[PDB]
């Protein structure tokens, strides 16, 4: 069968890598696998009946050093309330704002949140909003393996409590959070090493109850095509 289809099995858990930046400085990183997805919080803890594994963004610390902008960070964190939920259902990633901080998002490069022609949207409150569709990603990944397109983007970036930094250095923003579904990072890496030859390379999908796959470039491309045939497109 097609081992890549495990990505879309109802009940399957993806691993998400969450990395937080205060003023362009990495302050936190955690990898989460949970049937409920994840929920970014500032530790106003907090309603435990809220959905999602709570991912606590750290207090900036009480140093005199940098006290000004860090007090702004602390204020934003203190207003996160219920926070920012992110979870998977089907071929989609969904987000929802459960607290008071307006949050904007984009699917971007690993290292650069904003370029990017502005944000892809604002995370909604009181209902879920789709932030990522695996379907077009796989189509673009197939194109990538054929030499005909760019590396497909999979890094979700959230700007918390401020406008999206369009045409501004992203490092000026108080609270920026990157979430990478690590299966997608692995799929892109696997595509890059595929053209090395027709020997076998290993790809670790980083999903629940899954084993590292050893595949030839042909096998991999074949599985991607089969995977995309069973996915939903409008």
């Amino acid at each position: 069968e097609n081992p890549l289809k495990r990505l879309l099995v109802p009940g399957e858990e993806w691993e998400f890598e969450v990395t937080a930046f205060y003023r362009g400085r990495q302050v936190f990183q955690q990898t989460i696998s949970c049937p409920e997805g994840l929920r970014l919080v500032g530790s106003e803890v907090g309603d435990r009946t809220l959905p999602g594994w709570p991912v606590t963004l750290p207090d900036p610390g009480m140093s005199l050093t940098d006290r000004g902008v860090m007090s702004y960070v602390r204020h934003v964190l203190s207003c996160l309330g219920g926070g920012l939920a992110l979870w998977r259902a089907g071929q989609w990633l969904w987000a929802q704002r459960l607290g008071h901080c307006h949050t904007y998002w984009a699917v971007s490069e690993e290292l650069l949140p904003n370029s990017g022609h502005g944000p892809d949207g604002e995370v909604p409150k009181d209902k879920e909003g789709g932030v990522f569709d695996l379907g077009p990603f796989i189509v673009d990944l197939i194109t990538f393996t054929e030499g005909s397109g760019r590396s497909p983007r999979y890094a979700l970036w959230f700007c918390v409590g401020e406008s999206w930094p369009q045409d501004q250095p992203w490092t000026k923003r108080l609270v920026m959070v990157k979430v990478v579904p690590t299966c997608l990072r692995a799929l892109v890496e696997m595509a890059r090493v595929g053209g090395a030859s027709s020997l076998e390379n290993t790809v670790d999908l980083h999903i629940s109850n899954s084993h590292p796959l050893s595949l030839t470039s042909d096998q991999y491309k074949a599985y991607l095509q089969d995977l995309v045939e069973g996915m939903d497109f409008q």
Partner: peptide
């Protein structure tokens, strides 16, 4: 700096 926070009320 100048920070325009986008935080709603209760």
């Amino acid at each position: 700096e100048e920070f325009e926070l986008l935080i709603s009320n209760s």
